[PDB]
């Protein structure tokens, strides 16, 4: 029972706070600095992982590899592959610490 | 000056193997059993056969010079029976009355931790 915590936190944050996902959208968020933390899928191509992680460390933001693959669609509430998440406005959730 | 030798006594409801070996456990000294003693095709495990064979090996070992004997008791096998055969007690009695030095007696009859199927089917034997 390790990833159940992150699953629940993501479930709460989708209800509670503004969210953006998609490669171009997350790039824009990290460039403008609005992003607060990024969730990256495990099976995402290594180039995307490297570029997102480098941009995060340059822009002073968090980063978190998910426990599983790019089937975060079943967890995030959508119905399609997503493979990357940027949380622009954390709502009332315990994801920061 | 005291020297020890192993004596395997194998009693399996039949011929009582007497097998005196070097204390190490290889290159045995004298193997007599009970078969070549009784020619009646029966009573191999009878006390008479074991007693006389044991007294013969006692005389032979007196001649050789070894006196101290450890005892290793084996009975049939892990798949046929579990109790020592009738002739084992007679062999022990004969070795006691022989005059040979006796050491330690121990049981080495194999005990199967597994449950390998033994002879006769589910209905079992009929005698």
């Amino acid at each position: 029972s390790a990833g159940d915590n992150i699953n629940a936190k993501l479930q709460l944050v989708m209800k509670s706070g503004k969210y953006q996902f998609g490669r171009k959208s997350c790039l824009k968020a990290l460039r403008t600095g609005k992003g607060k933390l990024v969730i990256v899928s495990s099976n995402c191509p290594s180039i995307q992982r490297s570029v997102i992680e480098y941009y995060a460390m340059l822009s002073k933001c968090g980063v978190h590899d998910y426990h599983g693959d790019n089937n975060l669609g079943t967890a995030c509430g959508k119905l399609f592959r997503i493979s990357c998440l940027v949380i622009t406005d954390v709502g009332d959730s315990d994801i920061i610490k | 000056e005291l020297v020890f030798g192993v004596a395997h006594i194998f009693a399996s409801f039949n011929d009582t193997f007497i097998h005196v070996t070097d204390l190490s456990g290889r290159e045995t000294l004298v193997r007599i059993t009970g078969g070549m003693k009784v020619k009646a095709d029966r009573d191999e495990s009878s006390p008479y056969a074991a007693m006389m064979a044991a007294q013969d090996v006692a005389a032979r070992l007196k001649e050789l010079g070894v006196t101290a004997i450890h005892i290793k008791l084996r009975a049939s096998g892990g798949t046929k029976s579990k109790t020592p055969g009738p002739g084992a007690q007679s062999a022990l009695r004969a070795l006691a009355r022989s005059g040979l030095k006796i050491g330690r007696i121990e049981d080495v009859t194999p005990i199967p931790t597994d449950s390998t199927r033994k002879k006769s089917g589910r209905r079992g034997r009929r005698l």
Binding site: Q11, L12, S16, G73, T74, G77, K78, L79, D92, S93 | -
Partner: protein
Amino acid sequence: RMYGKGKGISSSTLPYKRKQPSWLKQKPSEIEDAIIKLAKKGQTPSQIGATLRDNYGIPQVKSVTGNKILRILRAQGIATTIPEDLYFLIKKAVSMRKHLEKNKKDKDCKFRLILTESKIHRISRYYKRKKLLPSNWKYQSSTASALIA
């Protein structure tokens, strides 16, 4: 018991006293304020009531406030669109389906999946018997993963 055997008579019994406890002085206004804030902070209503009873000491909310917990949560529009029990049971359903796809040999898992999905259909029929659910719900086993929202 619904399945297997065993009555399991263990449960919780509410006290004979139905008014507010005489020692209590806390006011409902702050009681509803605190419950709304916490249920927004994130917790399902059963444990919401549990933590209200434990950490906050407001026994018999139906007595200390003139309304029940689900109704005071829903009256502000924050109400979850699926009931607590059905949501939890569907989560269990998707969990053992995720396991059984990996392992097609677990026969007791198959048994309990059949049992739980029968319970799912029964409870869904009950909840749509009232006006407490969209009438178009069918719960196909395909979109069960994302149906939790």
